[PDB]
Amino acid sequence: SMKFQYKEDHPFEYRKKEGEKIRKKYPDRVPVIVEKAPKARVPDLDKRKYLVPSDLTVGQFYFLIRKRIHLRPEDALFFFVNNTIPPTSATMGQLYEDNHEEDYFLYVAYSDESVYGK
């Protein structure tokens, strides 16, 4: 029951063409949409559409997103993919292949809460 607003701004056919094309142009990268979860009490990131090395781990990706967001040091942040916090040691390539949608994008939500949408 994940709701990514990005899917409302671009038609599916447009997204799928872009996802397939960017994967063909940069096979060592994965395209990722990173969006604040419903109800999250965190700011939005400056950017939503990312291109990520496939061998980067989830923990490294978290480091870089947690660094970029406008939070104080004490503030909490959690990621969700398909309603589930991803494993720190997984690669972004694995996470992408396991979870990308039919448009060839991976969708990651983030929240201050440990359960998506709370």
Partner 1 sequence: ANSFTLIGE
Q: Is 71 in the site for partner 1 (CB under 8 A)?
A: no
Query: By three-state DSSP, how is residue 111 classified?
Result: strand
Q: Which is nearer to partner 1, 49 or 117 (CB)?
A: 49
Tell me the C-alpha distance between 93 and 89, whole Å: 12
Tell me the C-alpha distance between 87 and 93, whole Å: 13
Q: Is 51 in the site for partner 1 (CB under 8 A)?
A: yes
Q: Is 117 in the site for partner 1 (CB under 8 A)?
A: no
Q: Is 61 in the site for partner 1 (CB under 8 A)?
A: yes
Q: Is 77 in the site for partner 1 (CB under 8 A)?
A: no
Q: Which is nearer to partner 1, 37 or 93 (CB)?
A: 93
Tell me the C-alpha distance between 92 and 32, whole Å: 9
**Least spacing, CB of residue 118 vs partner 1, in Å:** 26
Positive/negative CA dihedral, 24, 81, 5, 62 = negative
